[PDB]
């Protein structure tokens, strides 16, 4: 009924960055999302878990490496693990 | 084996633009993809439905709004709904 599902989003960088704050490693969480920010605009949620960056799985990489992959471009493709509800009708 | 998948793609504009044709609206679909084109190489298949363009939900947008959004940048970020075949080996 409540569980965790994978979804993907792309963040387009603006002048204020990606607009999110990541934390940890193995594995990385989205700790916070900037109001009116690119990440907020792309569908990134506080508490999402980052599974892939630009295709590359980061489930077992370090924090700094993850920040590296994220920063590498004008946009970032992320694969995220997030809460999802199942309702029977 | 065969079913439906939500998926994200970046397309970078070629010498000949994006390399695909969009028809209708609500929901806009990919009518065709030029062989060897940007869109083909980026993974875009004929039959896909366009859910988002550069972070904007376009499922309720008019054909012209979606074309505008797509042409707005050098690259475009698409959230696509399409069919997919899979095989566990």
Swiss-Prot record, chains A, B:
Residues 8-84 form the PDZ domain. Ubiquitously expressed. Phosphorylated by MAP kinase p38 (MAPK11, MAPK12, MAPK13 and/or MAPK14). It is found in: Cytoplasm; Membrane. It comes from the Eukaryota. The poly-Pro region is essential for plasma membrane localization upon stimulation. May play a role in the regulation of RhoA GTPase by guanine nucleotide-binding alpha-12 (GNA12) and alpha-13 (GNA13). Acts as guanine nucleotide exchange factor (GEF) for RhoA GTPase and may act as GTPase-activating protein (GAP) for GNA12 and GNA13. Involved in neurotrophin-induced neurite outgrowth. Interacts with GNA12 and GNA13 through the RGS domain. Interacts with RHOA, PLXNB1 and PLXNB2. Interacts with SLC1A6. Interacts (via DH domain) with GCSAM (via C-terminus). Found in a complex with ARHGEF11 and ARHGEF12; binding to ARHGEF11 and ARHGEF12 enhances CDC42 GEF activity of PLEKHG4B, and PLEKHG4B, in turn, inhibits ARHGEF11- and ARHGEF12-mediated RHOA activation. This is Rho guanine nucleotide exchange factor 11. The gene is ARHGEF11. The chain holds residues 41 to 123 of 1522 of the full protein.
């Amino acid at each position: 009924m409540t569980g965790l599902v994978q979804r993907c989003v792309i963040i387009q960088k603006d002048q204020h960055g990606f607009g999110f704050t990541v934390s940890g490693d193995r594995i990385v969480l989205v700790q916070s999302v900037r109001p009116g920010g690119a990440a907020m605009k792309a569908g990134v949620k506080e508490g999402d878990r980052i599974i892939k960056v630009n295709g590359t799985m980061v489930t077992n990489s370090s924090h700094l490496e993850v920040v590296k992959l994220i920063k590498s471009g004008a946009y970032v493709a992320l694969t995220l693990l997030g809460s999802s509800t199942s309702t029977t009708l």
